[PDB]
Amino acid sequence: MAALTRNPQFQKLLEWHRANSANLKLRELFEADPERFNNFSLNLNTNHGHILVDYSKNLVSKEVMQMLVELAKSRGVEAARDNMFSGSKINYTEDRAVLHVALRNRSNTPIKVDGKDVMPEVNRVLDKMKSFCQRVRSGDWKGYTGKSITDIINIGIGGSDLGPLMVTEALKPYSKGGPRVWFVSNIDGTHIAKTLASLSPETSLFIIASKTFTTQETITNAETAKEWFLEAAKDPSAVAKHFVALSTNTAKVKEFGIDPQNMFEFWDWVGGRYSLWSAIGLSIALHVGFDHFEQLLSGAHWMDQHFLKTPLEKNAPVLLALLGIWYINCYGCETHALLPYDQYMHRFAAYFQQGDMESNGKYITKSGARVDHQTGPIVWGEPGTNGQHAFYQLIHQGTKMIPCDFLIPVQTQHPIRKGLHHKILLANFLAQTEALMKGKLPEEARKELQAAGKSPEDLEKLLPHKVFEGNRPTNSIVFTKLTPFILGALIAMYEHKIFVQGIMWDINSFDQWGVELGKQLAKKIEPELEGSSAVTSHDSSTNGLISFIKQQRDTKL
Amino acid sequence: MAALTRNPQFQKLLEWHRANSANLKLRELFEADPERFNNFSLNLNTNHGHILVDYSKNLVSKEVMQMLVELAKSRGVEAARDNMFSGSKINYTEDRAVLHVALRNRSNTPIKVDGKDVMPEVNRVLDKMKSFCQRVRSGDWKGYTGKSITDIINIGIGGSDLGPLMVTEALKPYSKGGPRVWFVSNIDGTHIAKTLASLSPETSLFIIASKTFTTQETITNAETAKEWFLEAAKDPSAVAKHFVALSTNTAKVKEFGIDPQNMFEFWDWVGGRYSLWSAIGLSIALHVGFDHFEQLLSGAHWMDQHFLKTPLEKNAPVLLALLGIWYINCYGCETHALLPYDQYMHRFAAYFQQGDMESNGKYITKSGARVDHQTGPIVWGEPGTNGQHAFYQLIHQGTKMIPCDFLIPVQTQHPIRKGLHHKILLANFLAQTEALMKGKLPEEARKELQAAGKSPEDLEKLLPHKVFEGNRPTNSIVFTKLTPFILGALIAMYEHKIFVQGIMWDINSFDQWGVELGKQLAKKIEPELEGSSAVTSHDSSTNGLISFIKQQRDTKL
């Protein structure tokens, strides 16, 4: 078996769930205890706004939370956290440190890897980013025909794309005066082609974002961009005014034709899905300004310190992690929905779909054992209120239990119509979790239909369809305003939630052998697509699909 | 007990699964049967391109498919389908016909509701749409200062938003000569504010899309748009030049102040999530032209005819439905992933999130009995190749079974670099489903670790982390090109998949009672947010969150 299932505190938790969970009814939990909100929420004062983590609408009692905290202690969460923060090589399959926390270590307390403090180099690259941002944003940096830069294009995929994309979308109001930012990621030629169609080579700056600098999609996209650029500029020296690199691989950057002076370095202990805090964040800093990028880092640092110093029973990422364990390993819920009531946060769910699933979508433990329990959930979601009109039907009246985190800023960036839109948005945010909790009893629906004027026949026909069973648990995460600082704190909070779950499951949150597999796969099929000859080298499906491609690719439509 | 679980063909299938499902291994199924692709795929010739539905990489034998087809028959799928097409009121809770098939009924064969052919009115509205499209696209339709329209803004939510958005995104290359299209949906004031910031009142035309014309989000957004417009135009009579309506409710359209000639009508038998084919698709027709809109309709009509005429055992939407039943009701898979290897299709998954989940996220059967089995899955996904770097880690190496549909056009709209990008994209599409099926054996990974120079100790430790169990089932759906016609067929195919699943579960795919409770509770909270007074009328969580909002909304950050 595996560490979690062999753990006596987990077996106690699970046994309690089997014996007692059917008796947990949210509506009744609240009625019985007027202090429920007070005892099952955290109001965090960061001194730059508050974050309220209200976990009271969860299927938990004091005893459940106690058992969960004991399990975290039994699973050695505190020691593991400390090991991450001190630069221990906790990425054991790759023998690497895990130090995204060093990237935003505003205190500058030394963090050592291999006896050497990483902070001087972290800060050197940040200084280089700051200087570069000033030069570009001021209009001082000129293109090959002597014009200021108007457009910045990040080329990268996965960890080198989604962070910068999500954050520049979320912090859009802070981009006034900054250059337009574009993200190219897919190898699909549509992505680069449609982007380049809107650009001038004279005023576009490309950012090639790649830890390895060998990823097929990114290097191919970069080469396509360079070819397009050089067709116009016709001068290799012009590349240095228009192409920069964010990477750990100096040799491959040089090979591509980028000046080492145009290279913004990061390190092997920065996981891609944890990399927006590093040089990978350059497009963020260019778009919103370095000061706002620093505020983002500072928010993360606040949350880092919260995670590091707070007792587990009052520790926000730990509690979120433990509630997840409860739903995943005791209730068996496959999914976790992230539902931010904020259009600017429209890529937040997608970001953590990567952050969570690539981290904890694992099945081998530190001991080499195959897990005999569930690990990471499927993470999904869309911003409210749109979701209410798309898939909430299923959340309310389907056959699935779906833990949801509802997120919203108190203050809107756009208080139009004297705040009318935000009032309605807030009302829906609140009402939805209330509804999921409370439901609507047959007798309550019966009274409603009676009042609506329905005949005894029509009422009886319609009744069961109008019943909401409720008891659907949510987190509500509410924050003063979505500033760069508060966003940094929220991202870091979920990063540490993911960390805690991974430790408890005894898996490595920080490798990605499935992703590494992917990068080895396409090479075998590529040459087989060339020419008209039939391919017989694979299974009949792969073969048949190739035959279809070859048969269909010359047809005129 | 419910209809499905009481069905003897279902009982046989479930019993077969219990006794035999451990014997099903994809690798073995292909090894034992060289005709597997040939017998477990459908190559559909539409006369406007081919659609290959390759379902061979699924955990099914000939016997399993036979059992599934028998179940579809004994659950009344053929009769239920015929009832939909004939205008029977199969939406039994609302007593409505279900006739999105009539909207695209290119044959013009009479379809009666209450003894009246609906086709004349369908065609009348289409004619009106065509005329309006000519007026706007030609530049003949002038704004209040006499200028041609350059921007169209659809305002709507859910069914009045996702379809038009997804289709205009997917068919972008077909929009030459068309006005720019914008989609405002969220009540969050960010959405309309950032949209209006980039527009001129002189050249913008708003399309107010609302079946009911009372949806709070849409009408509020519409009124905000009108306020912005009138600040510039300062003349209420100019509204008629810049606002049109897509509705079933003539009166409410008139109350808002729109010209009755500016109203594009649809009918109660057009479900919101099945509405893009109706007047709701006006923004599509404006963007890509009416001819292309007609091609979209014709593709759907082709698939309607395929669904209607084809024996179940070779009927594409039926087979897709049956595989889903197998994974949902026998394997217990909560989710279904849609993975288009196509940037233009980037909103396809979000569209069917509504189409699928709002239809089949249900728990009450036709008899009024509660289901005692799973219904609709959670639908999710992002375009390839991006997912390969992000959540495919979990698909390959997690603890969840996740049926995936991989979709791709053979021909790209942007064959840059002599087809290099598309070759790579196709190679990845093919290699990923192959790898999901095959995995990687210990003997294969061992040799890789050996060749990489890993020590005997390191190899031993790394090995299980590098092994992939495989046996992960997929569908591959490959089509000649993503044209308006082919896109229409693909959407219609999934519509009918959803229909078949709904009939088999004995649920109503066409109502949405589960949105009501959240709406009611939001109306109650809205006025409570105003002013400084404490709110105590709810549970302590709702009260506490409101208190936090009132306390935090005046804080200056």
Ligand SMILES: O=C(O)[C@H](O)[C@H](O)COP(=O)(O)O
């Ligand atoms: O998402 C993945 O983990 C990586 O970030 C992605 O494969 C890109 O890798 P690169 O930064 O080395 O190009």
Ligand SMILES: O=C(O)[C@H](O)[C@H](O)COP(=O)(O)O
């Ligand atoms: O998604 C829902 O089913 C509806 O389409 C949505 O609420 C919009 O309703 P309306 O078209 O009546 O405004």
